[PDB]
Design a protein around this ligand. Structure first.
Ligand SMILES: Nc1nc2c(ncn2[C@@H]2O[C@H](COP(=O)(O)O)[C@@H](O)[C@H]2O)c(=O)[nH]1
Ligand SMILES: Nc1nc2c(ncn2[C@@H]2O[C@H](COP(=O)(O)O)[C@@H](O)[C@H]2O)c(=O)[nH]1
Lengths: 166, 166
């Protein structure tokens, strides 16, 4: 029993991920100095990114967890009105899901909204959505690991890997 | 801006936590060899423990996330009937919540159910519940950090700390 990488074109080590997440955390801490952000994790794929990210943000903050599908499974529990909100996503593909979520959150009138996403495949972008804190921009490929699944499996791989289009 | 420990009687470093979680992961991997566990994370407090734990279990597995309160906020999404289920909890206090959850899960007839909890305060136990994979047994105190909150705050501290009864 060992963690094995797929043969896809995208591969990112736990160490590389670790270093990038720490930089993003430091960036957020700096940008939100003097404030109390409310980080909203988009389940299920972003829960590991969320876990590592928050531990790299030396600020007083709160968090929530929600589920959403393309075209809202889990609702918000804490108020976001007037809060400085930070959405934590796993990967931005077409951008549809994030687009719906941002409109949903904006309807409640938060003080501000910024987005943190571990990955982004801009060649697949169909709706322009903002990503203020991006881990890595990658080519078009189906990735998995580090929270992201492959038919519900492989969310436990400590690294990001992928399969071939075939 | 820096992570600061409270003055309570319970203090556990990120390093100590890291080492213990890795041992538990190795234990699960060994016990569940040849099987495909389904880990159910009890939100919100156990999401960091969950993130680190799964990355220390070199086995094919699936996961889900649910919310529950003393005396069921977020429901199950994946089937558990016939599955070898592992509940991932943050801390066992009176044991009431875990007791309800186990009965809930058992009603669906899983193949087996085992429990992993980062912490346990047995002096506060009112209902005997099983913990097959325990991180640390601690004295009675209100802890926070590493996913656990203090009025919704401090879930981001990379270590477990606590406050004084006063
Ligand atoms: N596991 C995995 N999920 C993906 C990938 N690309 C997109 N997704 C899923 O699709 C969701 C939204 O994609 P989008 O709405 O931007 O098209 C993401 O949050 C993610 O859960 C991928 O390459 N691997
Ligand atoms: N943050 C924090 N939460 C606790 C503590 N003790 C109990 N809880 C919360 O209460 C829930 C269940 O407690 P129980 O049902 O065993 O009495 C736990 O899952 C946890 O969320 C504590 O010391 N600190």
């Amino acid at each position: 029993g060992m963690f094995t990488p797929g043969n896809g074109p995208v591969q990112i080590s736990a160490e590389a991920i670790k270093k990038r997440v720490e930089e993003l955390g430091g960036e957020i801490a700096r940008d939100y100095q003097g404030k109390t952000p409310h980080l909203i994790c988009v389940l299920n794929g972003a829960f590991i990114f969320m876990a590592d990210l928050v531990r790299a943000i030396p600020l007083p903050l709160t968090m929530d967890f929600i589920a959403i599908s393309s075209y809202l499974l889990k609702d918000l529990r804490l108020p976001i009105h007037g809060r400085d909100v930070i959405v934590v996503e796993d990967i931005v593909d077409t951008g549809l899901t994030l687009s719906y979520l941002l409109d949903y959150l904006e309807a409640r009138k938060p003080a501000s909204v910024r987005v943190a996403a571990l990955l982004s495949k801009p060649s697949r972008r169909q709706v322009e959505v903002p990503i203020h804190y991006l881990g890595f921009e990658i080519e078009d490929a189906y990735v998995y690991g580090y929270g992201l699944d492959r038919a519900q499996f492989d969310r436990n791989l400590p690294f990001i890997t992928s399969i071939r289009p075939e």
